Amino acid sequence: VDISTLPRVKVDLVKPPFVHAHDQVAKTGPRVVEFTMTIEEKKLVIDREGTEIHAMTFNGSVPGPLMVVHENDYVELRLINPDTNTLLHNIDFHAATGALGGGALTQVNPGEETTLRFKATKPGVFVYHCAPEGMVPWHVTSGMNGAIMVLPRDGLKDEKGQPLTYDKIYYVGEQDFYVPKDEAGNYKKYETPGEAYEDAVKAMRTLTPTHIVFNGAVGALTGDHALTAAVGERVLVVHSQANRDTRPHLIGGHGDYVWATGKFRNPPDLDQETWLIPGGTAGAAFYTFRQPGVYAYVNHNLIEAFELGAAGHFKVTGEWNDDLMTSVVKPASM
Amino acid sequence: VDISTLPRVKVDLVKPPFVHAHDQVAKTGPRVVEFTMTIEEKKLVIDREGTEIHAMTFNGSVPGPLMVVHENDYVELRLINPDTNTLLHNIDFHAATGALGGGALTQVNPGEETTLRFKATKPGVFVYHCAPEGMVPWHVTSGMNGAIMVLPRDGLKDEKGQPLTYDKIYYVGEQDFYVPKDEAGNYKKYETPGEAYEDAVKAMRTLTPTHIVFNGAVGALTGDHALTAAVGERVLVVHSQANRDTRPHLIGGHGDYVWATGKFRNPPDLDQETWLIPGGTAGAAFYTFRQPGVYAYVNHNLIEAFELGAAGHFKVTGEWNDDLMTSVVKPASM
Amino acid sequence: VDISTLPRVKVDLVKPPFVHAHDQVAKTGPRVVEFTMTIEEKKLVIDREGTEIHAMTFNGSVPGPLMVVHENDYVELRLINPDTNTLLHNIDFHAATGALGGGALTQVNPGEETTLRFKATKPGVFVYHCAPEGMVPWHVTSGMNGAIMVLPRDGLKDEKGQPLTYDKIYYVGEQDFYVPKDEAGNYKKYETPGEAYEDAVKAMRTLTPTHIVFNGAVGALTGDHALTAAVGERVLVVHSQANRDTRPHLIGGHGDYVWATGKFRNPPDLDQETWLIPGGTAGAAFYTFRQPGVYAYVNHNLIEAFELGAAGHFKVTGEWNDDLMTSVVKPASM
Ligand SMILES: O=N[O-]
Ligand SMILES: O=N[O-]
Ligand SMILES: O=N[O-]
Ligand SMILES: O=N[O-]
Ligand SMILES: O=N[O-]
Ligand SMILES: O=N[O-]
Ligand SMILES: O=N[O-]
Ligand SMILES: O=N[O-]
Ligand SMILES: O=N[O-]
Ligand SMILES: O=N[O-]
Ligand SMILES: O=N[O-]
Ligand SMILES: O=N[O-]
Ligand SMILES: [Cu+2]
Ligand SMILES: [Cu+2]
Ligand SMILES: [Cu+2]
Ligand SMILES: [Cu+2]
Ligand SMILES: [Cu+2]
Ligand SMILES: [Cu+2]
């Protein structure tokens, strides 16, 4: 076709774990969906100890925002690298076909911008990330990754082909960081990205992250920033990991319907306790809350969750169901 | 309903890898199934070198026993923490809905007990484990985990919906331990759990287990404690890993039908060589033995199996089938 | 039956990533397929730095060659261990049933040979590897592994049961090496395999590979040895990892149909970005190229890919499709 005859819609992205407004079932024909992201290199405090890294971000956040389109829409991304940044960046969409996912076409020095268009031909949730030749893992593990959801035009379907509709959606980006350590086990500090590079590579080559966090920091999805729901609500949690395997688990719940490797033409796995999202993948889990209270949402390597950071909370409001669970005899000395 | 109108059945658990008597197809309506477990903190020798750890157990074993119920039964667990123990414990069932899987309702100091009830609303094999706030991975990686199987009321079914009936069942719990090491690489020893805690955390944060074992120790499922079967028998092996990924493989056999992430509403994967059970999950594999002899059942990271401990044996009796395999020319010099 | 009444066919194997000529749909009844492999212990340079290891190979290559048969063919392997080698070797086929996959029947000292026959009763791609009692992971992680493909007699089928036919096939064997390091982080060197053994075990027990490579070396599948295809061609990539999990990804493409755990009686997963092949498994991915240019095929732990070696290239020829992807505004300063 002539792409110029298609409707265009502009989307202003929002900060994770929230997701820009969209419709599950497409209310228009195929569209060109316009997004803009501005790269920001910035200092970020990643843990309760105050460890501060030089993060590389799309749009100021770790992860980058979730983009949402429908199958056979076109994604048109304006990517801006302001002259206040120091490094070369680009973008690779796992949703796209050709040119290293767009990375070969989007190399931007500080002070430059570019616009890429691609057709979103496959439905699912997909990773996107920076990937500059020769320095790929350093950019990705400095936070330069996010996800895109390409919904089927008729929305999500269960294992029998009936509709699944979510009431709320959240995006959890999980980030493995590799802060260099000295012989004593202390975090080392660096004056410029160039001076950091070799020790960053050495730290990555240990294959042992120092931190594994949701939404950019230890505890980011707790307290006043806990996720929320009500009993009876249907929630979709999109979860990505651009570099390393993870295994999400909702403590006190389940994944009712899970696309662990994130691709919606496949039937979901039912009734999961824990699911494996391979590094370089996004997955999606759908759950209907049945009990109120605090839930922990974790990577179920519990060391990764509770010592390294990969844990957040839901706060769920509503009625307690004593048929589903009850204390028969509360803890006591007999 | 009124739960008080339902039948009650008490189950005395048995030590892994054996499993308490049960029926695959439910011969009664929904029931309240009563279990009791007594927590035991004890010294355990985990390897041939005589390395001794302070283990934390449900019912005296690593793993804890396998509980077996049917879908929409109620599980009523009396959990006892005798005053001979030192630590606070609780229990989180991945099978249950609400209150952190029961963990928020079951916190017991030494000298206390509690009774929890939950409805087993989802069929599958599931992990259970201790999870005291602030110290979760330490308890789990000290051995405080097991599994529960919630059978469909009409038993297991193949990928076409026809019945699969097992003749024997075994439960293999795989445990990653993190014994702290000094600069020389020697295992460190500790006088109290409190004095152990920080070094236990440091050792866990390496993400590198020192030992990975079946049934609590290197070689536990070998020799006089090898698993057994006969040619033609259908065997279900339930396998759990509460904290870390594993990849079971029967050396010389297959998983004919595998629920790698353990949930029986999904069709099984057929003809598997090796399957991935994510950390925080239980899985189940069904196989019909076709040849006699010794089999090794391993985690197929072969370093994990043969150097760190994650290997056991089957001893299978019966007829050799020369059509399936034969030596044509035995090893010789020509 | 009488196996002596069946047709015999001899196959001369070829070096990975290429695959010996075969037919997808079986043009004969069941056959005895005769293969010969000669073990070669040899020095191999594995990285750009010139690190040289003592490799243990089937047929001179890492990985060993891909064998291809059809379901219910018999595989008859003549395994030769020349007297120029030093070690004991054998072979375990994950495709086979009994005797530790053949390992109990194929133990050959230098100067010996043996012939094994087995019936290939399950369709799929499977690992084979050396497995001498007491020294299994050392042989496997020194390169002594490959794969066998057992095709359904009516070829591959999609998720709806319609035929999938590949135009080209490649075999990517991914190898984790554990070169021992000293306190400084330098690779240690050894005079005999016996003198190497304990430090090889210590290095393996770190669970941290020093190198992770395709086809035996960093960069082996690049440059003049890049994989090739044309736009519109259907390509099957068989990928094995005998010891450790991997997560393949075609940068700029997808897995249109993926058997991540490699067994063809199961429906494929569709539209994958990245898939998890557990250690001890072979998997297979089918893709139809839609854009020309350079693609990177990687393990999507990007540290493993770009720092440790697990990356190769496709060079694809043909027409660029501007509907699928285009640069709208090339990188520039505004
Ligand atoms: O960018 N990682 O959440
Ligand atoms: O039950 N999750 O720890
Ligand atoms: O929070 N990780 O050290
Ligand atoms: O729970 N009251 O014993
Ligand atoms: O408790 N782990 O087998
Ligand atoms: O074939 N298992 O090592
Ligand atoms: O048995 N593990 O050192
Ligand atoms: O196997 N007898 O040569
Ligand atoms: O033998 N490994 O590619
Ligand atoms: O998109 N692969 O890096
Ligand atoms: O190429 N690996 O160090
Ligand atoms: O791409 N030309 O602005
Ligand atoms: Cu970047
Ligand atoms: Cu990528
Ligand atoms: Cu405990
Ligand atoms: Cu848990
Ligand atoms: Cu060998
Ligand atoms: Cu094997």
- Enter the resolution in angstroms: 1.3
* Domain assignment present for C334: no
C-alpha distances out from residue B215 to A143, B176, B244, C18, Å: 40, 11, 16, 43
Q: How far apart are CA C289 and CA B139, in angstroms?
A: 50
Q: Which residue has the tokens 């057709």?
A: A119
Asked if B295 contacts B316 with a C-beta cutoff of 8 angstroms, the reply is yes
Mutate to test the interface with C, among B187, B271, B294, B334 (most CBs of C within 10 A): B271
* Domain assignment present for A331: no
- Give me the number of domains chain C comprises: 2
**Bridge-based pairing state of the strands C281-288 and B145-151:** unpaired
Shortest CA gap C308–chain A (Å): 7
Cβ atoms within 10 A of the Cβ of C42, count?
Answer: 15
In Å, how far from its chain's centre is CA B69?
Answer: 16
Asked if B91 contacts B80 with a C-beta cutoff of 8 angstroms, the reply is no
Q: Which of B117, B152, B187 is the last residue of a domain?
A: B152
Same domain, B130 and B172: no
Exposure letters A129-151 (e unless 16+ CB within 10 A, then b): bbbbeebbbbbbbbbbbbbbbbb
Asked if C15 contacts C65 with a C-beta cutoff of 8 angstroms, the reply is yes
Closest residue to B279, CB basis, from A209, A251, A300: A300
Shortest CA gap A250–chain B (Å): 9
Asked if B89 contacts B130 with a C-beta cutoff of 8 angstroms, the reply is yes
The DSSP string of C170-210 is EEEEEEEE---B-TTSPBP--SSHHHHHHHHHHHHHTT--S
Q: How far apart are CA B84 and CA A99, in angstroms?
A: 66
Domain of A111, in residue numbers? 1-152
Same domain, A294 and A187: yes
Q: Which of A152, A187, A206 is the last residue of a domain?
A: A152
Q: Which residue has the tokens 């040979």?
A: C113
Cβ atoms within 10 A of the Cβ of C333, count?
Answer: 10
Mutate to test the interface with C, among A88, A114, A207 (most CBs of C within 10 A): A207
Q: How far apart are CA A100 and CA A285, in angstroms?
A: 28
Number of the ligand 9 atom closest to the C-alpha atom of C146: 1
Q: Which residue has the tokens 């990892």?
A: C241
Same domain, B225 and B98: no
* Domain assignment present for C329: no
Give the DSSP letter of residue C304: H
In Å, how far from its chain's centre is CA B322?
Answer: 35
Cβ atoms within 10 A of the Cβ of B5, count?
Answer: 6
**Rg from Cα positions in chain B:** 21
CB within 8 Å of A236: residues ≥ 6 apart: A156, A166, A168, A169, A170, A284, A285, A286
Token pair in block for residue A97: 């076909």
Containing H/E element for B138? helix B136-140
Q: How far apart are CA C191 and CA B296, in angstroms?
A: 33
Number of the ligand 12 atom closest to the C-alpha atom of C327: 1
Same domain, A159 and A219: yes
**Is A139 within any annotated ligand binding site?**
yes
**Bridge-based pairing state of the strands B66-70 and B145-151:** parallel
- Tell me if residue B92 is catalytic: yes
Closest CA to A120 of A152, A161, A144: A152
Closest residue to C325, CB basis, from A96, A109, A245: A96
* Domain assignment present for B332: no
Any chain A CB within 8 A of the CB of B247?
A: no
Asked if C291 contacts C229 with a C-beta cutoff of 8 angstroms, the reply is no
Token pair in block for residue B5: 């109108």
CB within 8 Å of B116: residues ≥ 6 apart: A325, A326, A327, A328, B75, B76, B77, B79, B91, B102, B105, B106
Q: How far apart are CA A297 and CA A251, in angstroms?
A: 6
Give the DSSP letter of residue B64: P
Q: Which residue has the tokens 């379907």?
A: A157
- Tell me if residue A92 is catalytic: yes
* HEC per residue, chain A: CCHHHCCEEECCCCCCCCCCCCCCECCCCCCEEEEEEEEEEEEEECCCCCCEEEEEEECCECCCCEEEEECCCEEEEEEEECCCCCCCECCEECCCCCHHHHHHHCCECCCEEEEEEEECCCCEEEEEECCCCCCHHHHHCCCCEEEEEEECCECEECCCCCEECCCEEEEEEEEEECCCECCCCCECCCCCHHHHHHHHHHHHHCCCCCEEEECCECCCCCHHHCEEEECCCEEEEEEEECCCCECEEEECCCEEEEECCCCCCCCCEEEECECCECCCEEEEEEEECCCCEEEEEEECCHHHHHCCCCEEEEEEECCCCCCCEEEEEEEECC
List B326's β-bridge partners, or say none: C117
Same domain, B194 and B143: no
Same domain, A166 and A128: no
Same domain, C172 and C91: no
C-alpha distances out from residue B148 to A257, B20, B69, B122, B124, Å: 21, 11, 8, 11, 8
Q: According to the entry, how was the structure determined? A: X-ray
* Domain assignment present for A45: yes
Same domain, B166 and B311: yes
Give the DSSP letter of residue C302: H
Same domain, A228 and A195: yes
Asked if A242 contacts A134 with a C-beta cutoff of 8 angstroms, the reply is no
CB within 8 Å of B189: residues ≥ 6 apart: none
Label residue B110 left, alpha or beta by phi (over 0 means left) and psi (-120 to 50 means alpha): beta
Same domain, C181 and C299: yes
Exposure letters C251-279 (e unless 16+ CB within 10 A, then b): bbbbbbbbbbbbbbebbbbbbbbbbbbbb
- Which residues of A fall within a CB distance of 8 Å from C328? 76, 115-117
Q: What is the CATH number of the domain that holds C86?
A: 2.60.40.420
* Domain assignment present for C257: yes
Asked if B129 contacts B91 with a C-beta cutoff of 8 angstroms, the reply is yes
Q: How far apart are CA B314 and CA B297, in angstroms?
A: 7
Q: Which residue has the tokens 């829409």?
A: A73
Q: How far apart are CA A99 and CA C323, in angstroms?
A: 13
Token pair in block for residue C69: 């048969």
Same domain, C63 and C173: no
Q: How far apart are CA A9 and CA C11, in angstroms?
A: 59
The residue whose CA is least distant from atom 1 of ligand 1 is: A63
Q: How far apart are CA A63 and CA A238, in angstroms?
A: 12
Q: How far apart are CA B302 and CA B289, in angstroms?
A: 23
C-alpha distances out from residue C157 to B268, C23, C267, C268, Å: 18, 15, 8, 9
Closest CA to B298 of B233, B258, B210, B239: B239
Q: Which of A119, A136, A152 is the last residue of a domain?
A: A152
Number of the ligand 5 atom closest to the C-alpha atom of B62: 1
Cis status, amide bond into C63, omega within 30 of 0 = yes
Same domain, B62 and B148: yes
Q: Which residue has the tokens 């949690």?
A: A237
